[PDB]
Amino acid sequence: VTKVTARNNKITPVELLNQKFGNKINLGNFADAVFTDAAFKNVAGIANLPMKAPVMQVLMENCIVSKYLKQFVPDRSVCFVEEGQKFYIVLEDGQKIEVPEDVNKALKATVSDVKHWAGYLTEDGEHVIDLLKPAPGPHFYVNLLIGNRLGFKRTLQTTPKSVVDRFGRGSFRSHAATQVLATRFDMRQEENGFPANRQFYLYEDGKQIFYSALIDDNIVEATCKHSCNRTVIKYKTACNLEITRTIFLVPHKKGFPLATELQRIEIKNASDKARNLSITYTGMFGTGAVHAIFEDVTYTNVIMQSAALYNDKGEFIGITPDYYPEEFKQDTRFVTMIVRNGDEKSFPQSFCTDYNDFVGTGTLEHPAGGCNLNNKLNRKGPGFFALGAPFTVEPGKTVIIDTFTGLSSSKDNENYSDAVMLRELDNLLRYFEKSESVEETLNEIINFHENYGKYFQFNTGNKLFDSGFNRNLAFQVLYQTFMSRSFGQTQKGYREIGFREIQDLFASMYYFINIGYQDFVKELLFEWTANVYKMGYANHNFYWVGKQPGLYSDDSLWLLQAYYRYIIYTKDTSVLNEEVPVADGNNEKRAVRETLKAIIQYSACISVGDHGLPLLDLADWNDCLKIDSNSIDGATKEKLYYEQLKKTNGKYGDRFMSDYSESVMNAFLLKLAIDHLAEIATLDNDTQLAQQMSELSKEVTDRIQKHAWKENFFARVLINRYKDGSYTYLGAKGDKLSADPNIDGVYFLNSFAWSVLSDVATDEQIAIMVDVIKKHLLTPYGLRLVTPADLNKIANDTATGHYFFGDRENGAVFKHASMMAVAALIKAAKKVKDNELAKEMARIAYFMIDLVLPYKNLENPFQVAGNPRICTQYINTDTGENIGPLLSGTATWLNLNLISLAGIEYTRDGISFNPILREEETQLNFTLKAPKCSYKFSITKPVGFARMESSEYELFVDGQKIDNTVIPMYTDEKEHIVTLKFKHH
Amino acid sequence: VTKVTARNNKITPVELLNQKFGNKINLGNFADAVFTDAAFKNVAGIANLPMKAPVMQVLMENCIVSKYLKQFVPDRSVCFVEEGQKFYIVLEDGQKIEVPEDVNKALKATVSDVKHWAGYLTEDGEHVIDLLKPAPGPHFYVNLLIGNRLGFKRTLQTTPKSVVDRFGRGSFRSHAATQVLATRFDMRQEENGFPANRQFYLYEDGKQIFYSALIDDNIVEATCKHSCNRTVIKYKTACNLEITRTIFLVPHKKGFPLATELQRIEIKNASDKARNLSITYTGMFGTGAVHAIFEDVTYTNVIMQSAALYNDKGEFIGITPDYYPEEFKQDTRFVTMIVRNGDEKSFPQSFCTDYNDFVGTGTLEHPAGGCNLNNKLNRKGPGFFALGAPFTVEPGKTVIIDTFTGLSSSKDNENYSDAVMLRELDNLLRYFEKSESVEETLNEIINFHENYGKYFQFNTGNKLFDSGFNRNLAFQVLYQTFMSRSFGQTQKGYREIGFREIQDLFASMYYFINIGYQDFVKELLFEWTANVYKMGYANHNFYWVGKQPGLYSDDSLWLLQAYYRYIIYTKDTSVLNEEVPVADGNNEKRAVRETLKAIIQYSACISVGDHGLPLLDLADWNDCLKIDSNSIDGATKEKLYYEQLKKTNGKYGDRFMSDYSESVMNAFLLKLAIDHLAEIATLDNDTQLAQQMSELSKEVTDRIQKHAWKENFFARVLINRYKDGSYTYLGAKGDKLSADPNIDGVYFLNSFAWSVLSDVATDEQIAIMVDVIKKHLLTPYGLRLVTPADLNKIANDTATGHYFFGDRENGAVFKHASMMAVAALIKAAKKVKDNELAKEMARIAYFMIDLVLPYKNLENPFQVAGNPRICTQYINTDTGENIGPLLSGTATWLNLNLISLAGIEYTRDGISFNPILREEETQLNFTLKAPKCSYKFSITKPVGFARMESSEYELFVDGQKIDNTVIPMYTDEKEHIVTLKFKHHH
Ligand SMILES: [Cl-]
Ligand SMILES: [Cl-]
Ligand SMILES: [Cl-]
Ligand SMILES: [Cl-]
């Protein structure tokens, strides 16, 4: 027997359709096709579609069309062609046959609005999704909801988060990986949570008429609306019922439970007769013993039971899971329902807590015992629940059903017990007693996010771009500030906060400072600073406490960038005097200034190699550069360094002798950190530190230029353990480590990116590196991280590849690294003397940006997939598809790059204004917010590339012409108009 | 707000029904009820049921009955009563109302055959299950299938196993935890595998008419039949189609894939017109990156793609998942289908490797794109597959569809690659080319399992008991021998073979030796012996290599029992001269005799405490006895012992000085091991070793009697770290560690069990311990492992418990320990001088056995649950429910106890015959096999307790009266008749 893989099947159905029917009928620009048999010999297809879409998949789903096609498809190839609003089927012999009337109607209905099969974005950037259409990808129809713990304790560690799909499916978490609603770990990326979560059934006379997660013949229209931090789903039934589901997380208030999700269900009777209905709201609680799910499911079942909840009047209101083991009694979950007939209030009348009893002989979509619940409290788990309530809807009236699903934790209370949960639940239910309270809370959420996004507002003509930046990107930046990489559609494991993830704060910081939350930014800075050891290295991860001390060599250097941004923007140098605990513990404290100095010393004097550059250690920002198999962490290095000092009679600050490899990216980060510290010291009137840092910066730049530049590129790694000279560096021409015979040497994008960002590379080096990037690192789908490399030569135990070509490490386009490179290109284009080179870099930067903007994913959704409102991780260079997860560094650097392209850069003297517009653009207007003032920026130019470095321009501030391009930060609480006009040449 | 837990809700619906209707109508012996509202104030129920069953749930599932009940509930309580073949509804005010005709008909239909709602057992012990009825428990409707790797390499590590439920759902594994069909790790115990596994749809004219996992209005009848190593499911449709699915694992043959599961689907047209139908067979391949499922699902999806398979003629035959990473490339999976119209052969015409496309806008039960597959090969995972084929069934004819789902592995081939899988698949498909080949293979499986269980055959009048022992228990013992505790309905993680699990071989050994596989038993013995270190300790776990050296103090001592059983039965002492590798590695080998001597020395001279008994170390057979928080494993103790010997100028064999605790269970195991080694040496003509072992046994018995007996019981552990005397022992009266104020001291069942089994306890001590057991350790649901204990005075970090009362460690009845105690009781009842004491112990033993026999679970299925063909782990002492998993030590010791109660015991001189029958029994007939002969045993007695120790009896062998009760092992290939008649008293 023989085997044929998916990738080895060269001929696609569309190619075969083009071959068979290309020269006989007009196939248009896009068409769809499907093989009619397992031999891949004949195809059935449809021609002239507005865009690529799985039209044949939907057509085969139709009984009439399938029946009609069955008389040709098995043996003959057919194609559908529309002429004069009339459909014909074309065979391989040229026969054109008019299809019957019913087939014609079915085809006309199907091909209608094909361009909207993936939904569309409103003027506010909200995604409107049809529930009956195929999904471009597992992440396309996903929305992320977050809580609000601002003004409370451990904001990062206690903010609730949730993921909601087009049908309301997903999971809900409270802190770390604590599950309120069960998460599903299965084979499919689409299944994030237990299927029963957030779903409900409506019964009329004991017979099911509605299920919230099934679109049947009784539903005439069903749509979902994904917006910022809330989801709305609307159904219309053939029996004239209007159903509206609104799902959102409750912002925290004093006395509330730690996590609470609210779903409001509005049932409106659009008929002229009163209807007596019943609602059954189902769900599944998440288990406390997550590990046991994979080890002992019986253990998870037998350690918990169900309990009923009653109010002060003795009426059943909800269910909770009760755990025996003490470790699982520190969190208490709850679900409650309330029914409002305008002003009358009623509570659920029945409940079920057994999945087997609920489903019975039916299925989850058609449960056999879904209407009449047995009211039996299960003695075991899992925490499945269903609450049933009857009600009556008068003609033209509406009934509301509010469901609160939440969790109380000991992480926010002392002497925690179930009594605490009961008290917090009582407070929550008292707060949401009136019907209008829910609407007020929703409006509060909406207004909070609208106001948060007002730090920077684009006002161009492109409504989609304006909405995507002003609302969607700002919300994603806030989300990645609170969570880092912990939760998502396919991010379901337990993850701690990585030290370098402070990169997120690079952007969100500004927003937070402009809604009066500067103290929150300071607290985040101090929390990160608390994870730096006395020597200078930092913990790699931390949620409640740090771990993995000094495992990676780059972690500590991002803190300098964060502090520089904060201090430059706010001018608040007092943070340097704050006493923060050191990661070593023992109740020792150190000033922030000393911690920054220690970081610089560790990365510049102690942990350095033979060439004076920082050591690679286990790895750096790039986790695949595991060159040294005998690497050591921070603590081992510290003890060995002290032993060396004692033995050699050295002094603290001397180099730690070894033959380990050196990282050039770390060298660039160190140079940038030293420059930032020099600027901070200058702002702090510390002249001695400023001049010392300036001299150290010059020394480090000289070392990098002398040892890292290799006549074609900046090397990525310097190798020191091969005395014979077989291998000495990696990441430039002549390194002898290229796995591609057509490429002489390996090239890393980060090399060029952070050589430009650190301000080490010169103009000639920038030009050479840009040429190399265009030659090798630039692909039709963007800038790839690195060219193929054969690391087995220098690291024998490097293992082999894990991914097909184009996926992740096998030549994919990582959007985070590409965005960093785009930042470097933007920075270079502002100051490079050569105008042609600047124009080329600007073109490359805009080309790369166009591949990352989420909204543009809706241009060809069924080819690029991704998500039209949330940034994804990487692009598959084999197919061009955008692949999750939804949380990554793409959003932060995209926001920074878009703001910098507008010309905004914060320096010691104010805003350094230097916009770089698109060639086709002729106008750019935006509004900027600042503590104590605001700006209205307008830029005008003719068609073509224009920049302040090599173009004639006029700049006015408040109507007064000015010469210097640095606009001061005003403090008069007024709005200042800035106008730039590029003269036509 | 306030909360009420399930256990705090004291009043049950049935109690309230009795209160409200008890004195007004006859409720019979059993009834069912449900609360009508969340306040638990009113009930609706039905009276006079044959047995407890969830009748009200089924009634609520009925639209007519629910509509009728809505007119009274939830405001008023109602009860259904059947008088004069007509149904009435009774209210709390005495009103009796005759229900309408439709309601009466529905109630009559539902109340019928309530006594068979959980199925029934055939005369062959096969479970017949109705697919429309509720499940007593998550394990009740489960069947386990195993392969056959006998005569091949690494039988334990390479035998395939599978679990099949009443609907055919489950998973399928090849070796270790390698998944052929996807396993599901979710919140529910019922979901063992992916829902689509082993399922198919039938379409007619493009419209779905049948789904194998859904019972709808088109299904008239649907039943499943669980038998030994095969499952059969039958459906009848309203359109006159008869569907039958037969699922079983293929026994291995040369050139076959390592794992292969075969499902045969027969479609018979019972109408008078030809039907043009289409079949779509679906499934999900298991992923190679199991950890990535919880870590990174995207990684799991992106590292694999789909590939199509074609035969020599170029015709599509199936799908396979193709992996890029090298680690997930040593195993290659496949699924293939073939359609037979009697003699004409055809292959699937379409396929769909994509769950989203298959389901479309519908569901898995009603897929939207299930009829017309898109024939698209997915570039990503997961390995979902559907194969579609059309066919035509003529009137009165049958169409067969054979599906082979399997896996080839590098564990059985050198230079493995995907080409090896193609070659093995070609061999398999060539073998199963004719239609009758599948039937021949099924008959071969059936005959093999029928012949395997002929070592011991009961021939009593109770057909259920005879089938449960002769067929079901034998198969379970074989299954546990091949898979110790690795796979099951709820045993879904990765587990290795524990050393203790050698206990399984205690039973299955005999069967194997009587089926021609003595060499297999020897290979298993040597494989276990290879995990014993030179010092004497053993690895705790091992699948391909051992791990955790000497982590537990009892592991090495079971090997002596295994060797004793084997050598005594076969008299093959040559195994003692075999050279086996030592667990230390370095290519060092040792003779078996020396390994046994080293085990004895380690447990008797080196690893001992202040009292001279074996050290507890981290723990012993009981994993909850973590008394010492500074325990060390075998290697640490070995290096410390060597440095101590060097420092103190000692010699090898001296005690390892320490203040660690001692285990009395280990002491009993050591005494039994020493006695066994003495007997082996005597059989081997090694007089010096026999004398040395006899003296050592006497000395160890003296130590145990002097330091372990505490005037009321045998202590469980001895404490040596408290010099002030605050605590010195645990497991007897006055130990000061009892957590129950009404019980003075803690008592362990294993203490008595292994004091009797090791032959250390005396008659007076046995009587005292039996009294204590009756006082404290005997409950209405059996013998509990241990009375409540504190264990916090001596171990500060002991935790606070994880289970509600009656579950596992919080007072449950563990069937394995109870069976060991029953073995001790049986052994004592045969030899104690006091006849009343023997009668009491026999009564207790039979009472405990009646709670463990799987078939009796069908007497009150909806209250005890369990499984009517497979033994479970423990009984919940709060409710009496039997709880899984299905694999445990219960089956082995139940088999041993049943055989011993029949009077069979193998000694040096032959069979020691000493039956112990039930008091009510008057006849016991059975047949026994020996490697060179066979016996027919018949025992007759009057009503009442009778034993050879205290009753007058006549024993005839081959018609000749004999005096000595030891029947020799004949070697003349004849059948010998043994008759034992107990004389009527007086
Ligand atoms: Cl995600
Ligand atoms: Cl890199
Ligand atoms: Cl199991
Ligand atoms: Cl024990």
UniProtKB/TrEMBL annotation, chain A:
Q: Its domain of life?
A: Bacteria
Coiled-coil portions: none
Keywords for the protein's UniProt record, in alphabetical order: Glycosyltransferase, Transferase
Keyword match Transferase: yes
InterPro entries found in the cross-reference section: 6-hairpin_glycosidase_sf (IPR008928), 6hp_glycosidase-like_sf (IPR012341), Gal_mutarotase_sf_dom (IPR011013), GH65_N (IPR037018), GH94_catalytic (IPR033432), GH94_Enzymes (IPR052047), Glyco_hydrolase_94_b-supersand (IPR010383)
The GO terms describing molecular function are:
carbohydrate binding; glycosyltransferase activity
Transmembrane region positions? none
User: Residues in domain Glycosyl hydrolase 94 catalytic?
Assistant: 455-827
Give a yes or no for keyword Transferase in this entry.
yes
Q: GO biological process: what's one of them?
A: carbohydrate metabolic process
Annotated ranges, domain Glycosyl hydrolase 94 supersandwich:
198-412
Q: Name one Pfam family in it.
A: Glyco_hydro_94
Q: What is this protein called?
A: Cellodextrin phosphorylase
Organism (species): Acetivibrio thermocellus (Hungateiclostridium thermocellum)
- The primary gene name is cdp-ym4
